Structure formats: structure tokens, C-alpha cells
């Protein structure tokens, strides 16, 4: 038969290793050859695997590369304008890859260009936070300084938002070992940790959902119209460079001032942290000075697209996704993924062969550019945002899936949480200690649900991946899942550095590629159910108790005001009474789908179930970001990979004790309630009888 | 047999009179007792001709209305503050209604309290071109003067608006007999002519769709945020008052300052037509001096939404709506229409009881506070969002049946005109001369197409009636059939006047309400081959030719630059490509759906047909107007009552000469020729093969 087992028995761990091996063997940087001859290589497979259409989907946007013949670097200069000590102008090669050509230096893709010099201020992680600290109770003034941050917990483009509206003059961004180099494990080649000469590339913009900078709301196609650079989306205006943990400490060394007002600003470097402006005593005349040089340059990115056909609903697509471009070699970071959607591909395509189709059509993307910010998702759904609207069932991302070998990590709407419980019960756990008992069972004792006993943890979905514009944008339901660590936010310790390659993978993390293994059974798992049952396998009562659970958490928040609430009159009551109401149709609706031969009934009901993440979509989007229009879920203003519920909500209450208007502050926080408590009353209403 | 002659031949004329009559023996005013009252009547009468449910939905929205203990009024002033001279505290009532009470009192709604004295200007229609006239060819400044107007050519807030960006300080409001008298007939009683104290009510609001001024975006529902009165959408910034024509002579004789630039500045009033600044000679010294006490008022209003609930896709929604409020007793505007309606509702009704449904299901809906700007309409559809998007099939308008007795008038978009054709052929001709002749016949011979020989005239939807939420921002399919005269946008004499009464209507329009009954034919007709068709009854062939004559008037329009179009390289290709695309894609559609009992295929196809409409929905709306989202069709942004093709690109071209920064202003033009052709390119796709 052709069922899910057929197409779960295929997969193979050894199909997964042969193609991450073939994608990994030389740099696939967005908007180079490399990376174009890929996308064909990739076209002409799937077109051999047996799917029925295979297109490459072009866009010209904006990327940005270093100067070849003029490279970044940052210097201490001494008193007469001498660089006593400069940074390095790349990252030592890898064993058996030092001869390897067009490495991209490490660099800070949409930096500006700028040789400012100044004195540093340090600033831990660069926070919203950090910054409270540093100006608020420690008096530091950043305006003209150069801030020094380290990498982890949060997005570097929203440090670098920070530090700009801060008034810092550039950025040094570095990796401090004590969040990029595991106690007791070695450096690569010897082992997963990052060395001293290791750097983080990756992007700092700031695009809040809007895709290619150049083009907010519409494809970047050859006909497209052009904002100029100085209106572009989400460009920084100082200068950015990352540096390792050897260049760090050299400058970090020296630093004078003021102590780290506590241990949680303190790393692992034999250093003090003093959080400075400027150098000690004897170096005060010292000066830092960066020199940047990268441009930023219209180029051209592919996306692959790849068609299956449904037998049954052709006009009703479920898109496994994920990206192509990496930084480097891409080890784990996009190929652990790609080579997951390369063998499910695969394994459809063979029951393809044999004469099946999945009832719903399946799209399959490789996109391109994810690295330079979500560009080839973004653009693609820009392009067919109609079709996707009326059409679109669900959108299961794929990009790395593995970031450690402890357990699964899913992140999904609510709708999705059915799903992925009772997939999981019915695959093998790949745990040493688990042999013989479910995926299920391994996942929730490892990772237990702070709110529900002998469940699972499944996170909201944040941003910084594809899943974004289809998710936030076009309120598509989606997920994610991938094997992960015992944190969060920060990348495992060689992420977008030279040394994610083929070989961490297969010595270090999953040398039999049975999590590869398992990840391709989970994210091939779910787009199996939501393309073939007949039945959407979504429940909409999952999405009631999860609504409680933010109405009571963005209540509490503003109870820490409880002077303000009273006079300003500000009510939680709608949204209470909306998440009830929207509890109680769920039910209601839950028992039809369960009691309703009709087909037309089915469908009504499969579009009821389909619409039903579309309905907390509002097409005015939320303030000052037009392209985050899902009102339940935005990603945090303060940290672009975590996910915030209530978002609009919780943006009118952040740091509100300190708004020159309160009045006006708590007018805006009512009117978001206003907002929240309709949207979630409109979309109960989708679910209520029709007519 | 229960088919479309069934449904037809059970419309009586005889009941749509006892309707009209039953409508119109007092005032209904929105936000009234008596309009509450007849709301409740209507509910309750549905109920009984056998609809599935029928509700109120209410709201509490801005309304206005005069102070009943301070008058509103205009006085000439002489030198010492003497009022030698004030218009009309009211109309006079018509025979046998001079003991109405209730009836408002002639004004101009959301106009804002003030008393502004000043020299008069008078500015014609004071349309865009008006301004432009006096402004630039006679420099002629209106700065601080109080602007009088005649009514006519553009709706009355556009007006207002020109004459406030002018700097006016006031706007008089007029009716000429030059468009509100015509030659051979009597005034009101002894025939249809506006008398000289007779006087246009209507609000003066600019809303561009945003419906109640307080809460754009949200229902006005019981929990919902206001804004504050200073932030309200489209409130006008000077007092506005309207006047008959005796009052208006003698606001105008006295005119000195400039003659009238040419004769189509002169009306029919024994008056020179002078342009002015203020009076001649001997009364220099007189002013103009409004008075103006009205106030705003957030007042709850009532929609009666009634559902025939389809046997077969109850979750398809066609929607006859019309609203019910009327300035005082709307013999012709609106209730000729909601006579119409009832009579539709009656007949569905009496085939329910004899046991049909339709296939889909029917929704009717008696609108309030259309006369305040659309509000009923406006905040129903704002709070059923999601319901209208994914299941709106269409909506058919039934304001006012007729405003003349000369032919049918049908504004409706592309996707209806082949149903149109067909319709009409069926339906017998009410008029004299064409008896046994089809109405088709007798409309194609007194309204010839300007295109199309053996073609009727069919008119682009503009706005300034209930469709616009539904077609501008929804993108639900829309038309609207009345009968009409022999112009278009000023109104019948009696518009909006305390004249319009039943006896208007039995006594000179519609005598044997055979008009009426041809307009119920033609609307309920469409509602019901809309709802019961089982392939639905859009041929998108008919947008593909209308996309191909508005693509050759935009580029007319540019090309009135051509050296511009060299130095900025403005190209239109990407326009006509997409436009070439369309047509051959919807050829190909055409033929698929001629060529496919397969329900699936045929509601996929039902669902491409419903969905080709909301296509044409960017959701970043047009520019500075959020609320106007169609980017083939906008309301003009001088005259909302006309319709504008391409209007992103229309407005980026008007008046482009006069701009100081014409490099700025063609890129602008460019942008909207890149949106106009991606949203075609768009709309086409979305009738390609699904997959
Ligand atoms: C959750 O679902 C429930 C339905 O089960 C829904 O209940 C509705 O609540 C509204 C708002 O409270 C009710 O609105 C009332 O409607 C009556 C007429 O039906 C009006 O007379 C009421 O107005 C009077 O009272 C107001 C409050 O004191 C005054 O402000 C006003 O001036 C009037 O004097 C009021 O508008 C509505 O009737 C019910 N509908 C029902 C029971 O079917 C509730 O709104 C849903 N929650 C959300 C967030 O949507
Ligand atoms: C109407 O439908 C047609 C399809 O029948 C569609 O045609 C498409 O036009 C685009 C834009 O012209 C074509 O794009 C080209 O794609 C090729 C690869 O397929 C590229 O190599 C081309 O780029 C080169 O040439 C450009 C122009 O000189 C240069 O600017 C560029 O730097 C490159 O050197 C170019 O991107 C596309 O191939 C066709 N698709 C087909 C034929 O299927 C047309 O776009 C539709 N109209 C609209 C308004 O959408
Ligand atoms: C995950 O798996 C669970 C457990 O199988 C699924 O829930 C079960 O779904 C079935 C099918 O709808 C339910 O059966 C129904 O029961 C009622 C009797 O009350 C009957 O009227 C129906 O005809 C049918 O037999 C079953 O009750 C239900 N079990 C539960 C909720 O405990 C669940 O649907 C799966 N989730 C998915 C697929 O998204
Ligand atoms: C308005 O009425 C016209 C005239 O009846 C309708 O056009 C006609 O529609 C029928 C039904 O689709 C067409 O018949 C088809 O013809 C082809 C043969 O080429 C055949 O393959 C199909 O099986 C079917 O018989 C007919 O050709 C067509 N006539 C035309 C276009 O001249 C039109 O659909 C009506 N418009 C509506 C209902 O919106
Ligand atoms: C990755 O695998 C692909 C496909 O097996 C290899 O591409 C093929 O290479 C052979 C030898 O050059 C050609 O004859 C085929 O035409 C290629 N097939 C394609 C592109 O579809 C590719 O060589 C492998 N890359 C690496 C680094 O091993
Ligand atoms: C850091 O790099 C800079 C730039 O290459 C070095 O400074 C240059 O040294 C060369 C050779 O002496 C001079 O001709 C250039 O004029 C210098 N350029 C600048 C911008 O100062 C510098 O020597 C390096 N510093 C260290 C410690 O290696
Ligand atoms: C319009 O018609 C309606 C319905 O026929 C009339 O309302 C009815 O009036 C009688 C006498 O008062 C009552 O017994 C019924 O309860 C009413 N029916 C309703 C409201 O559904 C109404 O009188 C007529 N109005 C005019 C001006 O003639
Ligand atoms: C126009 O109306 C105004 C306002 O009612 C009249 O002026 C008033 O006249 C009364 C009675 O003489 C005075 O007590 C008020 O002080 C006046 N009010 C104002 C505002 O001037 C005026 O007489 C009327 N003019 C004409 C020509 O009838
Ligand atoms: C820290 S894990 C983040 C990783 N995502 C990415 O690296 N995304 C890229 C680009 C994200 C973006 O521009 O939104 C990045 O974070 O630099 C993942 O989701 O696996
Ligand atoms: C000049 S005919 C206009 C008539 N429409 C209306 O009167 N609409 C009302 C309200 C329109 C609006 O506020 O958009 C008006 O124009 O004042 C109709 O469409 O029959
Ligand atoms: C790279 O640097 C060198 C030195 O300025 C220069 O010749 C070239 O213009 C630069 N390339 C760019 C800016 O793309
Ligand atoms: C920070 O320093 C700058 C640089 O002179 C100054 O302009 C700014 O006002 C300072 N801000 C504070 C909070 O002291
Ligand atoms: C794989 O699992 C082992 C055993 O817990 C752990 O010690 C090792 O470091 C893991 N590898 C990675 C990369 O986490
Ligand atoms: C109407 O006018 C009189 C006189 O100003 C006044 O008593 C009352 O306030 C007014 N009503 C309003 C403003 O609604
Ligand atoms: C119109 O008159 C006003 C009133 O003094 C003046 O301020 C304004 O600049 C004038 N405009 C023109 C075009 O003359
Ligand atoms: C009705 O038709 C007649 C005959 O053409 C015309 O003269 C009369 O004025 C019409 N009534 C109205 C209101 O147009
Ligand atoms: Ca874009
Ligand atoms: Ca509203
Ligand atoms: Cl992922
Ligand atoms: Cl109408
Ligand atoms: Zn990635
Ligand atoms: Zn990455
Ligand atoms: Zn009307
Ligand atoms: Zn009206």
C-alpha cells in the first residue's frame, strides 16, 4: 500500500549523508555562480526524483558583499595615527579546505561603509535592556562612542538597532567564549567548539518582514521599480564588523572606566568587562578605528520550485520549504536541511512512480538568499500572495536540522500541535536509552511543556527563517523542527562560521545520521497528514487554550500598573470575553467535524479549518510594521528569532512607566486591546456555522 | 417549476407600491426613534416572508445634526453688524405635510460650528478645474473669503475640500436652476422641478472608505477605541451650508470684482455671474455671515441582515444590500429601492415555503447612516472581514430604482456584463414604443455603448453608495441597475430635498410602477442566477478587453509628455504585457471551463471565477488612501461619485506639469506602472492551472 508508512520506510539516513556530503564541498554564497549552479543541479534531481514540474523563480535584490581588493578590519591607533594592532582579514581555513577559493571573509552583510574612530564602550549583549543599564543607572553615554557587544540571546540587527539609536558610531560584534565554547569539549577540527579565530557572519538589517530592502510590498521582477538606497528598507547608518574571541580580548583588554555593574555582563575572557568609554590610564590616548568597505550591489538569487500535483485538491497547497544559500559550506546551516528535503523529495517521487499522488498539491522550495534577509521566501510569496492567500494550507520549514543531538525542538501554530503529538507517537526514538519506544516518549521526557504534564514542549514561532512571510505575513499556518541542545537564541558555537562543514556533522554531532534521519520523518511526517488526510489535521481547540494562556499573560503585565489601569479605565474584559467565546465555537465546530459522504460539507469545512490562521491576519498590520499583520504572533520588537503573543499589546505596555504621555501611552495600549479582543472574536466567527 | 421565471413572475409592481407607501408616510433619519422603528418593522416582515434568520446588527457611529434650539442660517451684514438679509430657517413643506414634525432642517452634515463673516467668491462647481481657473488664469485668491458654490458635476465633500486646500474660510452651497430646473416642467407639487426654496441635503464629509470617522479599520461595536474628534477621518475644517436658489440670488446679485471667465461659469439665475472678492461698489461694505451650530453626535444605528441559507454552498455569499435611512421621507432615495428589495425578499421567500433554496446562500441587508457616508455598509463589512473575503461571491446594490423614466442605467464591473446582456434579453421592455420588445433591445437603442456597436452602455462603478466597502476594499464582485433619464453625477431636481415624497414618485416617475418592477426584475434577476448558476456567472474574458482600453487611456494621458517619457525612460510595456497575459490566460480559462461532473474541479474553477475580483486587491491600498484597495478602479479623487481606471497611475500623472520636482514625479509614475502591471500579471495567474 501507499500510505505514510510506505513513505516513512523509504527515507534513508544514507541517502541524507551522500547528499549533505555533495552540497557542502564549496562555498554556496547567495548571488554567486556557485550557488546558481547548485539551484540547477537541485532543479534537474527533482525532476529526476519524479515531480511534475520544476521551475526556477529569479528576483534581482539587494545583497551586499566585502571589497575583494579592500578588506574590513578594525585597528587600535595609537596617538600619531599608527594601527598598532589590527583585527584579522579572515578566519584560518579549515583542514584539507585551505585551498578552497572565494571564502567570503567574515563581515556584516548591509553594513555601510565608513572608517570612524573613536573609544569603546561595551555593552554585554547589546539589549534593550543593557542599554536601560548602561544610560539609565550607570549614566554611560554612547553618543560618538564605539560599541563593543558580544553575540547571543538576541538578533544582531536588533543589537545594532539598539546601538544606533543609543548614538553609537559603529559596532564591534564578537563571540565570547562564554556563549560559543561548550566547558570541557575542543575546538574544531578536534571537536564542536568555536577557536579564538573563529567569526560569525550574517546580516544586520532591520527589514520587519519586508523582504528585498529595495522593493517593500512587491516582487523584485525585471519590471520592478526601485526605491533609491537612502529610502530602502532596513539598512543600518554606522559601520558593523564581527570579530573572534583572540581579536576580542586584544581589544577588550585595555578597557577603562567603569566596572561591569554585575557578573551577567561578565564572559569568560581573562578580562575585566569594564564597560568603559575608552582605554586604562596609559592607553587612554588609544583609539579604535574601523575600516569598512562592503557594498552593497542588485543581484540576482533562484529559488527552485517544485510542483506534486494532488489528486484529489490540486487548488490547495501544503509548501515544504527551506533554504539553499550559506554563509561558507553550510554544514548544518542550510544543508543538514537541504539534504532532509532532497531525500523527502525523493521518497515521494518514488511513490510517485508507482502511480500515487497526495490528495492536496505539495510545493517544495529551495530558496535563495535566506542569509541576506528571508529575500527569496519573501519575494517568491510577494510574487504569488494571491494564490497563496486563497490557496495556501500549510508551510513546514526546513532549514538545519540539527543544532545539537539531545532532543527534538518543534515550533508550530497551535493549530499544528495535534499533529506533531500524534506523528511522534508513531515514530521510533533515534535516543540512546530510548531504543524500542516512541520519538513521543524520548521528546517529552527530555523536554517537558512548563504548562502541561506528560507533554511536550512546542515553542511559538519567532522569525530569522523562511516560515516568516508565510506565517506573519499571509497568516498561513506553519512550523519547524529540528534535533536541538539541552541558550536558545545565540547559534550553536560554529554557527555561520568556515568551520561548519561536512566533517562537524558527520565526526561530531550525527555521525550514523539517524537525527537527520528523524528530522526528515518529523517535517516529511507532517507534510504527508496535511497534504493526504481527508480531514485537515488541524485542531482549532488547541488555539483556545493557547489564547487563554497569553490573555492571562498580557493581563499580568499591565497589573504591574494597577494606578495607571485605574485611571485610565483600562479593561481586559473584551479580550476575556472574545477567547471564551472563540473557546466555546471551537467546541462547537469540533463536534460537527467529528459528526458531519458530503463532500462539499468536508470542504466547507476543510476551508473553515484552512482560513482559520488567515483569520487573525489585519491588513493594516501592526504599528510601524505594515508586513506583521498576524495580531496573535509578531516577532519580539527587541528580538527578531523569539515570537511574542499579543504582540501589539505587549509593544503599547513595554517600558510604558516610561512614556512623557501617559495618557496618550495608555490610550494606545486600549486601543491594541480593542484590536486583539476583535480579531479574536472575527476569527471564532470563521468557525461558526456558515449560514 | 422553481426556476428564474418562478422567482420573476411572482414580483408584483402593485406590492412594491404598497411598500414605497408604507416607507415614506414620515421622516427616517439615521440614528432616529422612527428609523429604529422601521428597522424593526422590516426584521419582523422578513422573518414572515420566510427568511432562515433575520438580526440587527448595530453600531454607534459619528453622526451630525442641527441644533434644533439654535438655527443654522447665512445673513448679508451691513457695516454696523446689521443681518439685513438671512436664508431660510427651513423649507417649506409639501401639501398635506406641513404638520410632519421631525423633518431636519436643511444642512450640511459634520459641518463644523462657526460663524465666519467675510467677502464672498464665487467658484462655479468648484471642482479641481474651477480652482485651477480662478487660481491660476485669473489669480483670483480665495484666502479667508467665504466660497459660494453651485452643486452639480461632483460630489459636494470634494467641494469642500478644494475650497478648504484654497484657503476658503466658509463654503455656500447652492442649487442652480440651471441643473436642478428643467425647462418645461413645474416645480414641486404640479411636477418633478426643484422650487426655489427647496434645498439639497447631504453630508460633507472626505472619507475615502473609511466609514465611521472614528474607527477606521474596526467595527464601531461596544468595546471598540475611538478616536479623538481632532483625529477623526475626513472631518471637513470650515462651516458648510446649503441654500435654494431665491436665497442664493440674493446672496448673488450683489457680486462684483471679475466677470465670469466664460459662459460655462453662468447658470440660469437673472444674475451676472461675477466672480468677485465681495460686493459692488454701493455694497462693498456689506459681508456674508454664516451661522453654524450643528453638532457630532456618536449615535447607534441599526443594519437588518437577513440569510436564505444555500441547499448546496451555504458557505457562498451573494448579497443584495440597500440602505434605509433617508434625509427626510426618501420617496425616491432610498426607499424606491427598498421597495424594490422587500418585494425581492417577499418573492424568495414565497419559493422557500413552497420548498427551494437557492444553490448558494443569499444574504439581504437594509443598511443605516448610508447618508452620513456609507457607515452601515461600511462598519457590517469591517466587522464580517473574513467572512466576505473567503466566501463573497457578489453584491448587488439597490439604492434608489429610479431617477428618471427614460432607460436602465447598470454600473457594474467586467465579470457581470455578459450576465447583464443575458438578463436583459429575457426581461420584457416597460417602455412606451418597445412593447413585445425585449429590455435589451430597448436599452441598447436609448443608451448605445460608446464602444461597441448592437451594445449597451454600461459604466464603470464609481462610489457614493454602499458597494464601496465591498468593491473598492474587499474586491467582491459588484453592480448596481436603476432606471435613469437622458447630467449623471448632480442628482435628479428634487435630490435630498423635503420634495421627495411618494407622491413624487406615483404622480410623475412611476405612475404604474412598471419602472420599478423592470429594476426588481433586473436586480433580483441577478441575485438570482448569481446564486443559483451552477457554474457562476462571470466571464473574465470581459475584464481582459476593458483592462486593454484603460491601458491604452493611462498611456494616452502620459503621452501628452512626451518629452518627459524620453528624459525619465517611462515605459508602459510591463502594462500591456501584463494586459496580453490576461487575455490569453483568461482565453485559455475560458475554454477549461466550457470543457470540464466533477464537483470539485468545477468549485476549484467556481473559486478561481469568485476569487478573480479579489485579485485585483493590493492590501497596501492606493496612495493616502488605505480604504481604496482595487488597482483597476478607485472612486476619483475629484468627484467620488465617478469611477477612475488605473487610478494609482491616474493621480501620479494629473496636474504632473505643475510639480517642482518633476523627477520625483515621474518616478512616481513609474511606480504606479509597476504595480498596476504586477497586480494584472497577479490577477491572471490566479486562472492558470492550479498545478
Ligand atoms: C462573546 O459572545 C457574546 C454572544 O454570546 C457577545 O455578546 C454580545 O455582547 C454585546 C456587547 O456587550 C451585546 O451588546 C448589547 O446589545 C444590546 C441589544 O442586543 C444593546 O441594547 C446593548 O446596549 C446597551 O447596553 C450597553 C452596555 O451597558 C450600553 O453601552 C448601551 O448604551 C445600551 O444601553 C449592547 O449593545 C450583545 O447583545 C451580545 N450579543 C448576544 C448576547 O448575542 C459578546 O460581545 C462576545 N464578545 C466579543 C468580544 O465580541
Ligand atoms: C507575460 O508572460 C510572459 C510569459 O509568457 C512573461 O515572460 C517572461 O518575461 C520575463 C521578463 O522579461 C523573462 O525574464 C527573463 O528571464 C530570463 C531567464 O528565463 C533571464 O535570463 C532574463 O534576464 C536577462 O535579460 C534581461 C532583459 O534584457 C536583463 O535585464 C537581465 O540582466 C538578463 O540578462 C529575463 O529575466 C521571462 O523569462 C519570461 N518568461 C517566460 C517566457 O516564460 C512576462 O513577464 C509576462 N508579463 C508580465 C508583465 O509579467
Ligand atoms: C490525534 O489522535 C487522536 C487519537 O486518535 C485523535 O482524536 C480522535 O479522533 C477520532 C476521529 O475523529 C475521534 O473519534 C470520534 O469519536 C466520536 C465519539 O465521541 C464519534 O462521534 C466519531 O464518529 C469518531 O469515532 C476520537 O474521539 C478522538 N480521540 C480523542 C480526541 O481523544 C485526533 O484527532 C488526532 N489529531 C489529529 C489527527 O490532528
Ligand atoms: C450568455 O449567454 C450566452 C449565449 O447562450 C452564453 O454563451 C454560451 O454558453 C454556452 C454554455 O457554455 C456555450 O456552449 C458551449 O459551446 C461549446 C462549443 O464550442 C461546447 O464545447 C460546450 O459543451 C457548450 O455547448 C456557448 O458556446 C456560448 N455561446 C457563445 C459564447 O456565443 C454565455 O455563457 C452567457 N453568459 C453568462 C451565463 O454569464
Ligand atoms: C553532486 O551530485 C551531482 C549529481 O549526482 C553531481 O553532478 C553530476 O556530475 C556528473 C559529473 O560531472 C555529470 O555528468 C552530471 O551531469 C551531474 N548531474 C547533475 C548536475 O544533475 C555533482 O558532481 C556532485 N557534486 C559534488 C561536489 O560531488
Ligand atoms: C595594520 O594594517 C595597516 C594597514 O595595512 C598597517 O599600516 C600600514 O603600513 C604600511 C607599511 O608600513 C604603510 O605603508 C601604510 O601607510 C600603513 N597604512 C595605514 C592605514 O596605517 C599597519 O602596519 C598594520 N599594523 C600592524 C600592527 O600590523
Ligand atoms: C407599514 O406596514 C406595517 C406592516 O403592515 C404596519 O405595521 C403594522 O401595524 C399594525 C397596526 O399598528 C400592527 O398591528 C402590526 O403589529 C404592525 N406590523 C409590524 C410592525 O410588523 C405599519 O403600520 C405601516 N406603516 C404605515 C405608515 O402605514
Ligand atoms: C436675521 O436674523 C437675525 C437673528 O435673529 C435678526 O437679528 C436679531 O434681531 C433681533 C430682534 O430685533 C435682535 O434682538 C437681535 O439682537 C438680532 N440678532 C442678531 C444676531 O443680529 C435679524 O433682524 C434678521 N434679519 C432680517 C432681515 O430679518
Ligand atoms: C540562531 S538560529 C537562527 C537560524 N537563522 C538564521 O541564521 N537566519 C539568518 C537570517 C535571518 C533574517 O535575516 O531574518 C540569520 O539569523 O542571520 C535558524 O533559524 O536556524
Ligand atoms: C447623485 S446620485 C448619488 C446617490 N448617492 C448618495 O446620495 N449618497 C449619499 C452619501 C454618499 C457618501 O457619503 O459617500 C450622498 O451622495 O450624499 C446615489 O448613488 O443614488
Ligand atoms: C574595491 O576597492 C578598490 C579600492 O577602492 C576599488 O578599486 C574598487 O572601486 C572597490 N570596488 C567596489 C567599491 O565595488
Ligand atoms: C550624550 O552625549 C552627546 C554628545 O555630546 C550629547 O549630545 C547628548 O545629549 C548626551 N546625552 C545624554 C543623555 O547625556
Ligand atoms: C552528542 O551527544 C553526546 C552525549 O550526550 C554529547 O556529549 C556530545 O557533545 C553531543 N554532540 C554535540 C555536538 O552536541
Ligand atoms: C443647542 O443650542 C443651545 C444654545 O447654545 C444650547 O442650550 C445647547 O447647548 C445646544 N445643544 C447642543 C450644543 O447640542
Ligand atoms: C492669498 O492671500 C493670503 C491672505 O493674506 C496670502 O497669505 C496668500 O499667500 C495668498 N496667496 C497667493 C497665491 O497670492
Ligand atoms: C416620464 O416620461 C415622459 C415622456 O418622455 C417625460 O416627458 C417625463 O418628464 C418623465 N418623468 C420624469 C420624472 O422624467
Ligand atoms: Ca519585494
Ligand atoms: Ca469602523
Ligand atoms: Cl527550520
Ligand atoms: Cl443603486
Ligand atoms: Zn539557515
Ligand atoms: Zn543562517
Ligand atoms: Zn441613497
Ligand atoms: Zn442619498
Given at each position: 500500500?501507499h ?5 516513512l520506510?523509504?527515507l534513508?539516513?544514507?541517502?541524507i ?10 562555498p554556496?554564497?547567495?548571488?554567486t ?9 537541485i ?5 529526476e ?31 600619531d ?9 579572515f578566519?584560518?581555513p579549515?583542514?584539507?579546505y ?12 548591509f ?13 554585554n549583549?547589546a ?8 544610560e ?5 553615554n554612547?553618543s560618538?562612542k564605539?560599541?563593543?557587544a558580544?553575540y ?6 536588533n ?13 564591534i ?7 560559543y565554547?561548550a566547558p570541557?569539549?575542543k575546538?574544531?577540527?578536534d ?7 573563529g567569526?560569525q ?20 521582477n ?7 538606497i ?9 559601520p558593523?564588523?564581527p ?23 561578565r ?27 562592503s557594498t ?20 490547495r497547497?501544503?509548501?515544504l ?11 548544518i546551516?542550510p ?8 531525500e ?10 508507482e502511480?500515487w ?12 538568499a535566506?542569509?541576506?534577509g528571508?529575500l ?13 492567500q486563497?490557496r495556501?494550507?500549510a508551510?513546514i ?14 515550533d ?8 506533531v503529538?500524534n ?11 530510548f ?23 512546542i515553542?511559538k ?14 497568516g498561513?499556518?506553519s512550523?519547524?523542527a ?6 536558545k ?5 560554529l ?21 537527520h534521519?528523524t ?7 507532517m ?14 481547540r488547541?488555539y483556545?487554550?493557547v ?37 466555546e465555537?471551537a ?10 459522504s ?5 470542504r ?9 490562521e ?28 523569539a ?9 503599547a ?16 495600549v ?13 476569527a471564532?466567527?470563521?468557525?461558526s456555522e456558515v449560514?
Amino acid at each position: 500500500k501507499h500510505n505514510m508508512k510506505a513513505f516513512l520506510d523509504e527515507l534513508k539516513a544514507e541517502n541524507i549523508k551522500k547528499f549533505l556530503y555533495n552540497f557542502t564541498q564549496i562555498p554556496h554564497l547567495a548571488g554567486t555562480e556557485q550557488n546558481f549552479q547548485l539551484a540547477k543541479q537541485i532543479q534537474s534531481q527533482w525532476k529526476e526524483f519524479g515531480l511534475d514540474s520544476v521551475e526556477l523563480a529569479h528576483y534581482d535584490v539587494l545583497l551586499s558583499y566585502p571589497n575583494k581588493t579592500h578588506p574590513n578590519y578594525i585597528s587600535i591607533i595609537n596617538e600619531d595615527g599608527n594601527e598598532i594592532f589590527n583585527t584579522s582579514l579572515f578566519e584560518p581555513p579549515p583542514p584539507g579546505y585551505e585551498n578552497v577559493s572565494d571564502i567570503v571573509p567574515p563581515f556584516s552583510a548591509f553594513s555601510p561603509q565608513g572608517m570612524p574612530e573613536g573609544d569603546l564602550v561595551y555593552v554585554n549583549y547589546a539589549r534593550t535592556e543593557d542599554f536601560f543599564k548602561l544610560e539609565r543607572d550607570m549614566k554611560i553615554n554612547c553618543s560618538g562612542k564605539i560599541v563593543i557587544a558580544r553575540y547571543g540571546k538576541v538578533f544582531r540587527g536588533n543589537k545594532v538597532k539598539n546601538a544606533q539609536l543609543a548614538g553609537a558610531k559603529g559596532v564591534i560584534l564578537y563571540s565570547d567564549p562564554a556563549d560559543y565554547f561548550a566547558p570541557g569539549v575542543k575546538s574544531y577540527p578536534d571537536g564542536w567548539n568555536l577557536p579564538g579565530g573563529g567569526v560569525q557572519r550574517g546580516n544586520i538589517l532591520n527589514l520587519n518582514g519586508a523582504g528585498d530592502p529595495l522593493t517593500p510590498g512587491y516582487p523584485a521582477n525585471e519590471y520592478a521599480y526601485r526605491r533609491g538606497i537612502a529610502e530602502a528598507v532596513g539598512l543600518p547608518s554606522i559601520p558593523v564588523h564581527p570579530i573572534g574571541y583572540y581579536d576580542a580580548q586584544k581589544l577588550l583588554e585595555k578597557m577603562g572606566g567603569s566596572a561591569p555593574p554585575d557578573s551577567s555582563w561578565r564572559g569568560s575572557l581573562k578580562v575585566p568587562y569594564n564597560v568603559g568609554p575608552g582605554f586604562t590610564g596609559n592607553f587612554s590616548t588609544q583609539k579604535v578605528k574601523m575600516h569598512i568597505h562592503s557594498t552593497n550591489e542588485v543581484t540576482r538569487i533562484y529559488n527552485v520550485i517544485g510542483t506534486l500535483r494532488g489528486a484529489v485538491e490540486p487548488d490547495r497547497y501544503v509548501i515544504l520549504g527551506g533554504h539553499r544559500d550559506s554563509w561558507v559550506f553550510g554544514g548544518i546551516d542550510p544543508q543538514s536541511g537541504a539534504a532532509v528535503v532532497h531525500e523527502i523529495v525523493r521518497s515521494f517521487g518514488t511513490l510517485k512512480k508507482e502511480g500515487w499522488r497526495p490528495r492536496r498539491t505539495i510545493l517544495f522550495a529551495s530558496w535563495d538568499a535566506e542569509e541576506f534577509g528571508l529575500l527569496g521566501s519573501t519575494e517568491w510569496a510577494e510574487e504569488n500572495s494571491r494564490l497563496l492567500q486563497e490557496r495556501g494550507v500549510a508551510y513546514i520549514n526546513a532549514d538545519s536540522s540539527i543544532e545539537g543531538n539531545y532532543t527534538l525542538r518543534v515550533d508550530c501554530t497551535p493549530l499544528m500541535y495535534s499533529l506533531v503529538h500524534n506523528l511522534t507517537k508513531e515514530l521510533k526514538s533515534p535516543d540512546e536509552g530510548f531504543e524500542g519506544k516512541s520519538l513521543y516518549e524520548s521528546w517529552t521526557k527530555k523536554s517537558p511543556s512548563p504548562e502541561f504534564s506528560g507533554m511536550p514542549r512546542i515553542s511559538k514561532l519567532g522569525s530569522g527563517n523562511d516560515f516568516e512571510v508565510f506565517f506573519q505575513r499571509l497568516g498561513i499556518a506553519s512550523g519547524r523542527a529540528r534535533y536541538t541542545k539541552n541558550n536558545k537564541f545565540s547559534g550553536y558555537p560554529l554557527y555561520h562560521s568556515v568551520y561548519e562543514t561536512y566533517e562537524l556533522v558527520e565526526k561530531f554531532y550525527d555521525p550514523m545520521f539517524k537525527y537527520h534521519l528523524t528530522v526528515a520523518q518529523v517535517r516529511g511526517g507532517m507534510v504527508f497528514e496535511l497534504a493526504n488526510s481527508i480531514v485537515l489535521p488541524f485542531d482549532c481547540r488547541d488555539y483556545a487554550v493557547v489564547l487563554r494562556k497569553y490573555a492571562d499573560k498580557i493581563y499580568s503585565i499591565s497589573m504591574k500598573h494597577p494606578q495607571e489601569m485605574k485611571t485610565y479605565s483600562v479593561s481586559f474584559d473584551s479580550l476575556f470575553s472574545a477567547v471564551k467565546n472563540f473557546t466555546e465555537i471551537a467546541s462547537k465546530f469540533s463536534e460537527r467535524l467529528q459528526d458531519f459522504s458530503n463532500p462539499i460539507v468536508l470542504r466547507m469545512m476543510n476551508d473553515q479549518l484552512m482560513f482559520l490562521e488567515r483569520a487573525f491576519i489585519d491588513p493594516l498590520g501592526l504599528p510601524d510594521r505594515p508586513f506583521y499583520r498576524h495580531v496573535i504572533y509578531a516577532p519580539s520588537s527587541h528580538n527578531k528569532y523569539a515570537g511574542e503573543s499579543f504582540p501589539g499589546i505587549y509593544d503599547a505596555l513595554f517600558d510604558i512607566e516610561s512614556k512623557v504621555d501617559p495618557s496618550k501611552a495608555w490610550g494606545e495600549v486600549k486601543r491594541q486591546i480593542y484590536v486583539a479582543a476583535f480579531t479574536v472574536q472575527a476569527a471564532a466567527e470563521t468557525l461558526s456555522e456558515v449560514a
